Amino acid sequence: ITGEEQGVAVATGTQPSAPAMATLATAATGTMPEEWKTFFSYYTTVNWSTTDETGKVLFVQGLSPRMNPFLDHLAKMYTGWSGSMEIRFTISGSGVFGGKLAAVMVPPGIGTEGGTSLLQFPHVLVDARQTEPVIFNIPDIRTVLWHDMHDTLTAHLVILVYNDLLNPYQNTTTGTSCTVTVETRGGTDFEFHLLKPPSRKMIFGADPSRLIPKKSMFWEGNRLPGEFKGFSIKPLVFQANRHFDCKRQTFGWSTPEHAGVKLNIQRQNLDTEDKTDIGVHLVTGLKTIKSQVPDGWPDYYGRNIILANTTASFGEVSEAMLGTVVPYRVSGKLEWRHLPEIAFANGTAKNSTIVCGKYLTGNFYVGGNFTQQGNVVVYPAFWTSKHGDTKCIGEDEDMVKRIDVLPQAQTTGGNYPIYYVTEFPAAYLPAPRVYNSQLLWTSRLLAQDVYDIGPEALAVFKIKDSAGNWFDIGISCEGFSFVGAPTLPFSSLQFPLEASYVGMASAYNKLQHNIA
Amino acid sequence: TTVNWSTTDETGKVLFVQGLSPRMNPFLDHLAKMYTGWSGSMEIRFTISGSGVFGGKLAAVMVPPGIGTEGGTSLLQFPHVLVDARQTEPVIFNIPDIRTVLWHDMHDTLTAHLVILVYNDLLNPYQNTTTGTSCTVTVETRGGTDFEFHLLKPPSRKMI
Amino acid sequence: PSAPAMATLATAATGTMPEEWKTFFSYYTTVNWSTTDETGKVLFVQGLSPRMNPFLDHLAKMYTGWSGSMEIRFTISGSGVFGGKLAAVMVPPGIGTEGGTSLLQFPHVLVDARQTEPVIFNIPDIRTVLWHDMHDTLTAHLVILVYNDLLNPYQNTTTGTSCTVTVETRGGTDFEFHLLKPPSRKMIFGADPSRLIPKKSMFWEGNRLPGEFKGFSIKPLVFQANRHFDCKRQTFGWSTPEHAGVKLNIQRQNLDTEDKTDIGVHLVTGLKTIKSQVPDGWPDYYGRNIILANTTASFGEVSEAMLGTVVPYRVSGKLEWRHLPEIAFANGTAKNSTIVCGKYLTGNFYVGGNFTQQGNVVVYPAFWTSKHGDTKCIGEDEDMVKRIDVLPQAQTTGGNYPIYYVTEFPAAYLPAPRVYNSQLLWTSRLLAQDVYDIGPEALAVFKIKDSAGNWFDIGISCEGFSFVGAPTLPFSSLQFPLEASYVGMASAYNKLQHNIA
Amino acid sequence: PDITGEEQGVAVATGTQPSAPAMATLATAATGTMPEEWKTFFSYYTTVNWSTTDETGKVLFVQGLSPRMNPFLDHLAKMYTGWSGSMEIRFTISGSGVFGGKLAAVMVPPGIGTEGGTSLLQFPHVLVDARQTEPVIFNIPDIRTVLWHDMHDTLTAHLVILVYNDLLNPYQTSCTVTVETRGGTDFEFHLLKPPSRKMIFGADPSRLIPKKSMFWEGNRLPGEFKGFSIKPLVFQANRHFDCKRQTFGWSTPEHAGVKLNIQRQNLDTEDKTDIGVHLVTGLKTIKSQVPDGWPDYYGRNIILANTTASFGEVSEAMLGTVVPYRVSGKLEWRHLPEIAFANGTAKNSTIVCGKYLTGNFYVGGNFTQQGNVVVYPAFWTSKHGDTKCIGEDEDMVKRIDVLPQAQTTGGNYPIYYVTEFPAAYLPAPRVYNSQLLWTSRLLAQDVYDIGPEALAVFKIKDSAGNWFDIGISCEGFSFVGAPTLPFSSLQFPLEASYVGMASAYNKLQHNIA
Amino acid sequence: TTVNWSTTDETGKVLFVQGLSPRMNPFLDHLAKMYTGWSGSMEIRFTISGSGVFGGKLAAVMVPPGIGTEGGTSLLQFPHVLVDARQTEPVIFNIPDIRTVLWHDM
Amino acid sequence: FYVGGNFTQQGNVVVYPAFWTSKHGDTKCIGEDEDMVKRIDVLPQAQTTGGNY
Amino acid sequence: FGADPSRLIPKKSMFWEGNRLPGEFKGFSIKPLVFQANRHFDCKRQTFGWSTP
């Protein structure tokens, strides 16, 4: 006889307790069943200032479960949603402050540029001197019956400045501002759909919250490892190797691990044409992703290597010339003898030099071994820079190396791209640093699964430093990161950071930030 | 989970030892990150599915908090229900929440244990070359009737 | 300060009904019913004794008497296919369970091998006296005979097929202990025999010689005097039970061989005695008529030595002794470098060792020499055991056999070297200081557990010898981690049960 | 149907059913019985001494409420896991009518500290005179924080019997006070278990010190127990086991000899004037190459000379008596002498022994064959000028590693258990031990809960009523709460009771004539 | 408070002088910190401890405010409660709160 | 502390432990020997506990 | 487990002596780090110094 789900089964026990102890517990703590759907919860804050314009957009927000810290949690357990969700604004200006602030809902699709052209939507508007908070409802316009976790196209509640924050007083050190506080809640008609065990993944997606590690001590760079050392803003960001598109793809050639480079050192000299030259040896790829390039080969060292004077010491410039060698032995002690650091190269080995195209087309070469053949692992370890520069590793578009196509991200809708900055040693470069397209973890993932970030969407992670200084990061579908402002002063940021997923965002929407 | 009951087993051999814990249920496990405490019991459903010719019996015990679980025949002297090897309908057990506190913290461990002991061996009327045969006992969980969570915490907030 | 309230809250949390050990059935045994068990064969004999149900076992230690009936719950767990019929006979008190077939002429209930429900038997409390005493065995019995053999249609595995009968016990509706007594308080005519065998094998020492327990042996006959104590404190040996070794006064060569060719023999004085003239701890087993000839240095030429290690005693000074090496024990004056006498501890006691200085010393039995042909544990021989004036013994006690416990001791040629012990050291230390309930016609029974369902009752008699039901049970099959668990007082004349693979 | 309940089955009647109710009534009449007799009357618990020398506020008797307070409840408690309700205390002072003083019983609530001092008189006390000539009956309420108590709960209520006014004695002595206990009306056990189902988790501190002195063997050398000693600093490497099963030693708790192997070489000493020496290889090793069971104490600089006659050596290493390990033949060995033990390097005929057991291992003995032997450490002496018990000297305590050591800790002085060992011209020879052997077996096989700053305090009791508290630290070391107290008075047949978990750096209690 | 009593004490030697106050009790003493004034009586339980062999009597008298609290046999002559060295029981006597003013300062 | 031969003068250095010479012959993995793991004061150990290897 | 920690700091500044050396109290200093052994006693009576206070 078929056994039910709900349990058709028999009951049994022996010498039980009472249920009144449950009442005792309920007395101990007054936990009504479904509390989280009863109280708003802080989300963000915005600055409304006398520097602002009639029409300036203070807040742009779509319909997303992932905004509510609680519902965010539930979400891992469900497959879909529907209905709206409320927002409560808490403008708390003085009683003498003039001005008005406007509330708009933008039909799905219609862009949000933030001109006075927006104010011509239907719009309510709030006084600058309003006391009681304001409950807004972001209606769920939808063409489907129910949303998938990763759908993005939805209406936007936009907060525009109607009329400026007129202070009757104006003073030396001119400029004053009112704090608008945003806090969210599940609407009245907000229901989740089909159950999934939190451990089960979609065929066509993966929850983006698992893409920045919660605490910054875990973070690592994807170019060349190190200790995370902050962020950097660049109008154009560019990286071939160890970078992963949201489609499981690469135009790089390396597994994310950063486990070193496998190779053969060929005995063939063909190098020692000058007494001043340490040597160079042919290199054979042990293993490859594509195009015969050895796993983990350096992304960055440029047009040439000059072996003049190298017979003494590593002192030739801009050329990654310190890779450290480990024997890949399997049965007995080394044949090759006390093998020093070795300098990476690609291309055509002239009698005294190697010249390289920006590509990896040419055969591979590496610096002088005093001795015979070996199977070798090499870790890229230290950079000779120029005899003088301030350019961090990865600053030059003409020095990052391609195979076929180089992933780039430019400014998109006013969301400037970012470089994760980390420190590994170098020459002549004060405060040595390296640029990174992706955290090591953000790369490790995006290799192992097809994360559901859309062509025109950003998965937004809110980074809170200690003391509260915060800014927003967004992982585009192309993999690169973005920040909302060009020159936001990272330098001020407190050393240890924690990252919270805020949801998916419309691409073009300005990212929000609050850093002193 | 699942357990193996075999003709190699002994009257008193312990097939399953289990305490009261929210974290067993794949769902409640999730909720748990959102709450600070719990109370009440949680049910378990055993699904012994032996053949019709199989003899033997399997025993169900609840061990007061603290009292060790060694797995001797000494256990069978607790009060005990017992299940046929030929039972069809699954069996719903309740692990009562004995507690000295009013409500548990997430990480409290001292709780009663539901123990599954072999009463009498899995007698097959047939015995054959390559001797040894076994019945699969399947264990599956659910929140009891009186299972309530306590104070809310944002999943992002850690205990002192 | 208090309240009833607090007590009410604890009842809610915990559910206790105030005497609930009387409600459920508790495990007692499992009895194997074999497809090879001949008609009438007694599966299960058990006289009415509170000592079954573990909980009443505990509570009893606090009471002097008892009354009322008890309940036995059988769970026959065969397949639906098995054919077979199991008889249940209540024996009027005092009529013996002699032989299965006969009993069947009592009034008797038949229990089928394919029962879907357990069977609850209320062993009647027939009594001549108003209330029993914790030791009284003249009680009604319950005998479970096999009436029609356990048919299994299947014989592809041709032999050794079986079924399992588990026994559970409860107080009857009318069971009630009578007179309150302090725990640990000795009853008149005896102490509680529960504390006889340790709980764990770990603690099992033999009474003959020190060693780790290694198994059991069965013999038609049994005999030990030394360090063997009856249930009633009598002891025919000569030693306190402490394995302290024997500590002696060494006399010089005055009566040593004068025409010697080998290390001399020295007459000694016991210094402590339980029995007149007998040193406290004289090793009980050694060869008669030992020859110390050719005993230059090596002692390995000696046949049955009991070599002892030596150490000084209350010397209070500079250790004037020589290098004390090893001792050979002996008994009986001789005209040469020999020791003739035996069979009795009458003769003077002598010490084989290169000793020169007169004084007092400790010696421990430490190693056994043997003949190159030995295939026999230390103590197999009546002829080599040593008597003061009487050897106790036991033979087959109504179908029940005497066991020796076996332990390791280093013992020359014998591969896997063993010494037989009558009594466990524990059982000896006790039974020396206290009288025990074991009646003249009684057999206090214990239950020996390892694993895999292996068990076998060991019973202690009046005389203090360990008994078993069958004579050939495969001891070899057991697991070391043995555990003892008191059972009760079984009628001497019954058969002890046994259940081992 | 298939399912079978905790109490079910066909009822079957066999043979003669003898009319149960009538006989049951007859028996009930023959000996009346109440629902629980052990709650109707008073049972002797404990006597404690009271000396003229006891200042005001000296604590006589500390007893946190438990089932252990009464005999019958104590025995029943085996069958249960939890308890609740009050216990009634009946205490008496016996003494000559000539003696004079007052004694005050106070029911200390859980949160209070149970030390002496006049402040403890200041909350509800019942007082008895040395002349009262009547038992006084007072109740111990069951104050709780938790709905019911486990069997080891240390948060229980407390009973303290203080000295109120000192015990004057006109002539110029110690009176005696007896405690009798009784289950309260409210007492009630809880979750029911079988006995022989050992206590919680098998991590129970109560299984540490044996309940009788008959079993109190020591961890340094074998022998029957002779009491205790206090020292400012206490230390031992071997057979010493921590809370965590960590042992810096070189031995298993077995305490059954050293399983060693001898190499035939005589190491070419002076052909005379010494027995020579053999190197040693251990058959077994718990740690580094160290053979199982070298003596933890003996003199460095073992000058073996003139040793051919007899072991007249100064500052001895253990003499030990020897057995053949096991053989298949007659006996390969000859005339096995007493060994003397040594460790370090044989620089000379004399063995240079260090404080550390890093060196090779050697035995003094007239061997010539090669074979396995077992030796037992069996005798000792020092020079005539000595009176120091075995284990007293830092230097002579041999070390592989860090030498664990207990300092005077927060009002508590670490202790050595003293047991006798065979030795000469050392009056009343004793050996000092960091642990009992039972506390070495255990703490090896199981992990314990002994807190980082917690002690497991045990109430050790004379016959004569005296008592004091010994606590086992995380380090395994025993502590008592005085710099000195007259252990000389201690009657040899002690018993121990587990008192519970008490913070380390609170003082311990003691009551000795 | 405990006070000594010596064989050397003549008749009428004052053993214990204590004007009524909150200071007479521990708990009231501590509470008194929180208040400025007090009223009402306090109950005195006093004991003599001594060998049954010793002999003497001790007399507690509740001296009204206006009287001088020095020794002398005249002080026995107004309501006294007396305890023997052999009494073997605490004696319980009351100190009335005689006042001239509606309430007392500290 | 000491470390192997540099042919040259002083430096501030990072070193990564990278490869092991074992014995001229063994099958013991790195960390097999209790006498080869190095202490400061106390060495964390775990033994068999309640039958949990 | 402890005395009432109320009685730790006097009520009045007048009564404030330092544990290092005798003197009148003159103010407070703040440091990222702190260290003292002598005459410094923990809450639990332990003291790593050498002096009675």
JSON list of C-alpha atoms in Angstrom, two decimals, chain E residues 9-81:
[
{"chain": "E", "resi": 9, "resn": "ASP", "atom": "CA", "xyz": [33.26, 40.84, 87.25]},
{"chain": "E", "resi": 10, "resn": "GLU", "atom": "CA", "xyz": [31.66, 42.07, 90.43]},
{"chain": "E", "resi": 11, "resn": "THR", "atom": "CA", "xyz": [27.86, 42.38, 90.68]},
{"chain": "E", "resi": 12, "resn": "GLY", "atom": "CA", "xyz": [26.43, 45.21, 88.52]},
{"chain": "E", "resi": 13, "resn": "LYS", "atom": "CA", "xyz": [29.32, 45.37, 86.00]},
{"chain": "E", "resi": 14, "resn": "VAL", "atom": "CA", "xyz": [27.80, 46.43, 82.70]},
{"chain": "E", "resi": 15, "resn": "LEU", "atom": "CA", "xyz": [28.50, 43.89, 79.95]},
{"chain": "E", "resi": 16, "resn": "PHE", "atom": "CA", "xyz": [26.79, 45.45, 77.00]},
{"chain": "E", "resi": 17, "resn": "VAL", "atom": "CA", "xyz": [25.45, 48.97, 76.44]},
{"chain": "E", "resi": 18, "resn": "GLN", "atom": "CA", "xyz": [23.50, 49.57, 73.27]},
{"chain": "E", "resi": 19, "resn": "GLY", "atom": "CA", "xyz": [21.18, 52.40, 72.67]},
{"chain": "E", "resi": 20, "resn": "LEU", "atom": "CA", "xyz": [18.49, 51.40, 70.28]},
{"chain": "E", "resi": 21, "resn": "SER", "atom": "CA", "xyz": [19.34, 52.10, 66.67]},
{"chain": "E", "resi": 22, "resn": "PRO", "atom": "CA", "xyz": [19.42, 50.51, 63.24]},
{"chain": "E", "resi": 23, "resn": "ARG", "atom": "CA", "xyz": [23.05, 49.69, 63.82]},
{"chain": "E", "resi": 24, "resn": "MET", "atom": "CA", "xyz": [22.08, 46.87, 66.10]},
{"chain": "E", "resi": 25, "resn": "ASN", "atom": "CA", "xyz": [21.33, 44.52, 63.23]},
{"chain": "E", "resi": 26, "resn": "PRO", "atom": "CA", "xyz": [23.30, 43.82, 60.05]},
{"chain": "E", "resi": 27, "resn": "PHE", "atom": "CA", "xyz": [20.56, 44.03, 57.49]},
{"chain": "E", "resi": 28, "resn": "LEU", "atom": "CA", "xyz": [18.87, 47.04, 59.01]},
{"chain": "E", "resi": 29, "resn": "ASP", "atom": "CA", "xyz": [22.27, 48.65, 59.32]},
{"chain": "E", "resi": 30, "resn": "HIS", "atom": "CA", "xyz": [22.91, 48.27, 55.65]},
{"chain": "E", "resi": 31, "resn": "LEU", "atom": "CA", "xyz": [19.43, 49.44, 54.67]},
{"chain": "E", "resi": 32, "resn": "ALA", "atom": "CA", "xyz": [19.81, 52.43, 56.94]},
{"chain": "E", "resi": 33, "resn": "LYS", "atom": "CA", "xyz": [22.08, 54.05, 54.41]},
{"chain": "E", "resi": 34, "resn": "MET", "atom": "CA", "xyz": [19.06, 54.66, 52.23]},
{"chain": "E", "resi": 35, "resn": "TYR", "atom": "CA", "xyz": [17.06, 56.48, 54.90]},
{"chain": "E", "resi": 36, "resn": "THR", "atom": "CA", "xyz": [17.25, 59.38, 57.30]},
{"chain": "E", "resi": 37, "resn": "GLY", "atom": "CA", "xyz": [14.97, 58.25, 60.12]},
{"chain": "E", "resi": 38, "resn": "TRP", "atom": "CA", "xyz": [13.71, 55.27, 62.04]},
{"chain": "E", "resi": 39, "resn": "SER", "atom": "CA", "xyz": [11.04, 54.18, 64.46]},
{"chain": "E", "resi": 40, "resn": "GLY", "atom": "CA", "xyz": [9.77, 51.08, 66.20]},
{"chain": "E", "resi": 41, "resn": "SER", "atom": "CA", "xyz": [11.23, 48.34, 68.33]},
{"chain": "E", "resi": 42, "resn": "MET", "atom": "CA", "xyz": [13.98, 45.79, 67.89]},
{"chain": "E", "resi": 43, "resn": "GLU", "atom": "CA", "xyz": [13.95, 42.27, 69.30]},
{"chain": "E", "resi": 44, "resn": "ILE", "atom": "CA", "xyz": [17.00, 40.99, 71.18]},
{"chain": "E", "resi": 45, "resn": "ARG", "atom": "CA", "xyz": [17.94, 37.33, 71.38]},
{"chain": "E", "resi": 46, "resn": "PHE", "atom": "CA", "xyz": [20.87, 36.73, 73.63]},
{"chain": "E", "resi": 47, "resn": "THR", "atom": "CA", "xyz": [22.63, 33.59, 74.70]},
{"chain": "E", "resi": 48, "resn": "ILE", "atom": "CA", "xyz": [25.10, 32.55, 77.31]},
{"chain": "E", "resi": 49, "resn": "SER", "atom": "CA", "xyz": [27.41, 29.75, 76.35]},
{"chain": "E", "resi": 50, "resn": "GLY", "atom": "CA", "xyz": [29.31, 28.09, 79.16]},
{"chain": "E", "resi": 51, "resn": "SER", "atom": "CA", "xyz": [30.11, 24.82, 80.79]},
{"chain": "E", "resi": 52, "resn": "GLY", "atom": "CA", "xyz": [27.21, 23.50, 82.86]},
{"chain": "E", "resi": 53, "resn": "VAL", "atom": "CA", "xyz": [29.67, 23.54, 85.76]},
{"chain": "E", "resi": 54, "resn": "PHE", "atom": "CA", "xyz": [29.82, 27.36, 85.71]},
{"chain": "E", "resi": 55, "resn": "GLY", "atom": "CA", "xyz": [27.23, 29.37, 87.70]},
{"chain": "E", "resi": 56, "resn": "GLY", "atom": "CA", "xyz": [25.88, 32.92, 87.64]},
{"chain": "E", "resi": 57, "resn": "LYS", "atom": "CA", "xyz": [22.93, 34.99, 86.35]},
{"chain": "E", "resi": 58, "resn": "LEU", "atom": "CA", "xyz": [22.81, 37.78, 83.81]},
{"chain": "E", "resi": 59, "resn": "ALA", "atom": "CA", "xyz": [20.02, 40.40, 83.68]},
{"chain": "E", "resi": 60, "resn": "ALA", "atom": "CA", "xyz": [18.88, 42.34, 80.61]},
{"chain": "E", "resi": 61, "resn": "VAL", "atom": "CA", "xyz": [17.00, 45.58, 81.35]},
{"chain": "E", "resi": 62, "resn": "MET", "atom": "CA", "xyz": [15.41, 47.97, 78.81]},
{"chain": "E", "resi": 63, "resn": "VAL", "atom": "CA", "xyz": [16.64, 51.29, 80.24]},
{"chain": "E", "resi": 64, "resn": "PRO", "atom": "CA", "xyz": [14.27, 54.21, 79.32]},
{"chain": "E", "resi": 65, "resn": "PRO", "atom": "CA", "xyz": [15.94, 57.27, 77.70]},
{"chain": "E", "resi": 66, "resn": "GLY", "atom": "CA", "xyz": [16.18, 59.44, 80.69]},
{"chain": "E", "resi": 67, "resn": "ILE", "atom": "CA", "xyz": [18.18, 57.02, 82.86]},
{"chain": "E", "resi": 68, "resn": "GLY", "atom": "CA", "xyz": [21.95, 56.98, 83.12]},
{"chain": "E", "resi": 69, "resn": "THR", "atom": "CA", "xyz": [23.13, 53.52, 82.00]},
{"chain": "E", "resi": 70, "resn": "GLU", "atom": "CA", "xyz": [25.97, 53.25, 84.61]},
{"chain": "E", "resi": 71, "resn": "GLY", "atom": "CA", "xyz": [26.19, 50.05, 86.75]},
{"chain": "E", "resi": 72, "resn": "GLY", "atom": "CA", "xyz": [25.09, 49.57, 90.39]},
{"chain": "E", "resi": 73, "resn": "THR", "atom": "CA", "xyz": [22.51, 47.32, 92.08]},
{"chain": "E", "resi": 74, "resn": "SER", "atom": "CA", "xyz": [19.71, 49.93, 91.67]},
{"chain": "E", "resi": 75, "resn": "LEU", "atom": "CA", "xyz": [19.57, 49.11, 87.93]},
{"chain": "E", "resi": 76, "resn": "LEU", "atom": "CA", "xyz": [18.27, 45.58, 88.70]},
{"chain": "E", "resi": 77, "resn": "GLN", "atom": "CA", "xyz": [15.18, 47.17, 90.25]},
{"chain": "E", "resi": 78, "resn": "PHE", "atom": "CA", "xyz": [13.19, 47.87, 87.03]},
{"chain": "E", "resi": 79, "resn": "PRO", "atom": "CA", "xyz": [11.75, 45.28, 84.64]},
{"chain": "E", "resi": 80, "resn": "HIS", "atom": "CA", "xyz": [14.58, 42.83, 83.97]},
{"chain": "E", "resi": 81, "resn": "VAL", "atom": "CA", "xyz": [14.65, 39.46, 82.19]}
]
